[PDB]
């Protein structure tokens, strides 16, 4: 089999569509997601044209091997898609309608800057390489782009599934390649991070601040050091759900900043004890009383600054 020959010098237009059936396994660390969908293809092959009257049929059904089919691939996949051809239908004028159901693991970078209050644009890049006898270009049939209502991505809200209609045409190894960008817009369900990580982390921090109403150095050391260790556990927990980024994430920034608050609280606890031992408690009392206001105030202002820089 060979590609449909051009009537003039035109590139062959392959109309595409992706209909999402299942979305699952969005892996943050790996920056992948799994997809199960219909891939539809359509193109004109004049050599396949027929007269409905003469043939006694209005449609012709072929097997993939019987006819020419464009070699369509995904750019951003781990391995080649697992595909099963569902149908191939030819209209009297040689308009081919191809339908396959496929499953694939897609590589798509994620921006963790606003984590866990982040939104992402996942991409599925469709591609075709031109042949010596014909230049092949891709198009989007909007009537064949969509998603099942039941499509759910655990821990995420699905906003939209659209295609950038104009392909990105470029030369790769002296041949034309035509690339389409299918975009799946999602927003993270931040809900669970509040009772599981955010609030517990704030509670232990506020517990460290009770040391500002205590003259007991031994109890203070216990309050600040114990809560710091629990903060380390939360830091470790958070970093296990995320890849290593060359930038600070919102949560990462708060987690990092909280260490500074623990460090300064230890200085205060030390300074207070030192002065007490040196028979200067009036002074220690001034530092401790100031700390009761300064710590929550600087914490609130630093958080307003951070939220402003990130959102």
């Amino acid at each position: 089999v060979s590609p449909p020959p051009p009537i003039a010098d035109e590139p062959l237009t392959v109309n595409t569509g992706i209909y999402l059936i299942e979305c699952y396994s969005l892996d943050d660390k790996a920056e992948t997601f799994k997809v199960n969908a219909f891939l539809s293809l359509s193109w004109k092959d004049r050599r396949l044209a027929f007269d409905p009257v003469r043939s006694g049929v209005r449609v012709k059904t072929y097997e993939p091997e019987a006819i020419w089919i464009p070699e369509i691939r995904f750019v951003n996949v781990e391995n080649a898609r697992d595909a099963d051809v569902v149908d191939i239908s030819v209209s009297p004028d040689g308009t081919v309608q191809y339908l396959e159901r496929f499953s694939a693991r897609v590589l798509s970078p994620l921006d963790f800057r606003r984590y866990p209050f982040d939104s992402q644009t996942l991409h599925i890049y469709l591609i075709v390489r031109s042949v010596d006898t014909r230049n092949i270009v891709l198009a989007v049939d909007l009537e064949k782009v969509g998603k099942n209502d039941d499509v759910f991505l655990t821990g995420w809200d699905i906003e939209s599934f659209t295609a950038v209609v104009k392909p990105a045409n470029f030369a790769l190894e002296d041949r034309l390649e035509s690339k389409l960008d299918y975009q799946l817009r999602i927003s993270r369900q931040y809900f669970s991070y509040i009772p599981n990580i955010i609030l517990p982390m704030l509670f232990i921090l506020f517990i460290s601040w009770t040391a500002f109403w205590s003259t007991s150095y031994e109890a203070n050391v216990t309050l600040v050091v114990s809560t710091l260790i629990a903060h380390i556990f939360f830091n470790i927990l958070v970093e296990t759900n995320l890849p290593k980024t060359p930038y600070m994430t919102y949560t990462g920034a708060i987690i990092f900043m909280i260490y500074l608050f623990y460090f300064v609280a230890v200085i205060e606890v030390t300074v207070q004890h030192y002065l007490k031992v040196e028979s200067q408690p009036a002074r220690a009392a001034s530092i401790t009383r100031a700390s009761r206001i300064a710590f929550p105030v600087v914490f609130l202002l630093a958080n307003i600054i951070l939220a402003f820089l990130f959102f």
Copy 2:
């Protein structure tokens, strides 16, 4: 091969059945389960009619490639099922009896609201897409729906395996689709959560309340902070067995509430010490004595309220 021709104008009815052999790997985080079952299919293909006198045999056995077989798929699977055809029996009128044994990983959403005292309805959706020559519709042969007595799903009780007899017929990408809903009702075996998570979590909480019978601030700080950290470990343990939900689970609610009890216990311990240092122990004694009753009472009432909201 092409579909069987209609005698009048009716759609082709494909009778289905699923007989469960094995159920395993119900993954809560992934919201999947693995299944090993028999899939039975039955349809009339008059082009396969034969005379037992001429052919010698009363029933014909065919290889899948030799005849037309409806392209039946599962909607909610990760990858296409691993199937092995067991038998294809054709009777004189052309009635085909198809039997395959398959294994598949099924995507089925789980409601964790009542976890670990939750029940689920797992779904296996059978589907067929219509062809141009003719419309294909699915039906349930109740005599061919069931499960092996030995079918066990580790950590769950299997209640029932039934099929919604009426298919959901709908248009998808300018063609008819016929969908059947097979339902596997299960209930979680909550037993182990009691000695492993619930009771240990209650013991550490009650241990923190011994601080209400102590005037030693340093010991109190140790009691409340240490048990809080152990509570964080249980919170982390619980959250590793669950996906992130956009709602509160029953266990999550109790776990979250317990933090408030630890936070208020630290306030009480702080207030008590502060008053004792300020030479007001009579007052501190009133707060501590009230706390001995208030903490278990408010804990019991808050739990009754939570159990009521969730069950």
Copy 3:
């Protein structure tokens, strides 16, 4: 190809054997094990009989596609076995000797009641479904059942590999089914649990009891709470190696009971301090002295009771 025809009205007897080459990956949580073995099959096919002096050959070697082979499956497998046919030998009378080497992941429930001092009976269920032409029944050739001397299952002792000679013949979806039960008896190597979990857990518990020879409340709180937290770590460690069970395991029972001992030790430490503060140390001394005997005595008796209920 069709099944061999009956001389009278007899079912076709397929003689079976399983010879274990490798046993590996007994996964307690998943309740699975992997197996690599020979599967031998034997049946009479008269259509294949030949003269030994006329043919020249005493035995004829066939390719699987050339002859009829019974469709033998395993009931309790995750996916269909990976099989490679080794040899097919036909004797003059038409006795077929089939041999394949296969690998499979087997689902077999485990009884954790006596863990880690438990024994298990792993099952490999062989099955055949009858055809319209004739009923197929399974038999065990004991000469062809066995295991390689080098077969080792890490963490287990292999006791025996035997087959229940009488098949379970039953109707399933209007056809006969013939099931054989191959049993692999194993006993857990409990050795490592003693220096790694049992003894460390006992050492920390005995360390908590040193609080009965101390009047220092602050030190006592540290002894009992610290050791309790270490006990929680062991509880978590143990539960990660096990699935969730709707019953108590032996280790689970001991682990759970030890919490009660920590809880009562905290009460004792609290009561002791309270009395000391109330200027009643003589009394506190009576409770502490009684505790020195009561705690180890009740611990020993409770363990004798538990060992009796479980063994």
Copy 4:
């Protein structure tokens, strides 16, 4: 099919190229990375030469089975590559242009000496074994070596993808072998290690040094022992992200050295308490005051020495 015959006695030159489409899963522990790329091959086959004037065709397209194709393999792969032939084009002089898209898991050793400030040279070794008829040699077509602009390896910066043009020709099992070295130069994005591991580890260490401004032995023991345990947690965390090396890594060296600082701080805290108890606090005061300078100074100098030895 057989290899193209030599005109004289020359070896057959197979021109190669690798164009990277996707780079993912650089696993430090496993010392592997996954790759999705184009593999291009070119060689002259005179048996395939044709006349362009009479044929009217400038190029002929063949299926892999129709013609002789060199058996090109990767040396350092886990399993054989998953390949899909994209195109085979023959020019009138018989020059064959082969293109496949493949995916593979590549074994490539990593040097962790400077971790997490390390750079690596990943290798993809292309190989061909000579046939009895003729010797096959590999060459690099630089025009067909490259990478997609969007190629991202999570946690790494991609510097260059080049090929060592001169193959390594050698005898292996009495035949010639022709090996090409494709090099992917990468540098680790160390950013996240600073707020997540380095700084937290330094904060806890500096917190242990507050014990040099405290006479409270009980508080000092708590400060040094608690932070030491947090240091053990960071040591464990770091070692989980790395394989075991027969050399010290930069981070490993710092982590190890920090233990010595904790050990000496415990000695100091012990010596200080001992002297205080022995009624020699003036002396203890001299040791403690010296420690306030000595500990940060020796820490800075030891780090300068280490950075010098490693960079």
Copy 5:
């Protein structure tokens, strides 16, 4: 195809060789390793003999399906090897030279008694089964046994790769089987265990011994209990890298013994406090002073005894 006929009554000798290309994934817990190698086979088939003059060829190449090839298997593999035939060359006398490249996951038991200072002998068992026509026997062509210089097994040193030249011929399922033992001798790179596990474990133990220079019970309890808990963390860490063994490993023995040292240190700390409270400090002083010598001395001697029993 059938086996080559015997000239007299001799067995068919299949000469074998294994050339290691890659060694990776030595999994201690699973007792497996992955291998990528060349498998070479050689035997005489008279039926394929030719005259060089009338043929015009010195060697003849065949496709695996065209000729008889011995069914060679590996005994100790998880699944059947993934193989790709590289070459099949036939010389005039009909001597066949077969070469395949394969990858396999090999089961090979490990002796952990001296861990992490252990050495292992990994085995790759080659096997062939005899046929009714003739007995097939294996031999080693030493010229075709070897390994690539670049073969590295992460965390191990490769010593040698040799074959036991004499096969083990025995009957299995009424056919003779010819087994060859290929041995890969390796020694563990213990280096990293020293700064990561051994030394940290010794440092915390020595820190517990500072309690012998302290009269503070509260501080002593903190020193001994805290370090004990850190020892439990190291015990857990070590046991995660190892399978459960029915014997004590060298590291396991040291780890277990260290618990006894912690237990006795708690007794000493308790006894010391008890005597001090009972107004007998002179005595407590004698026990504490003796402990300062006894603990390190008994620790050194117990370690010499253990090293002697294990090495």
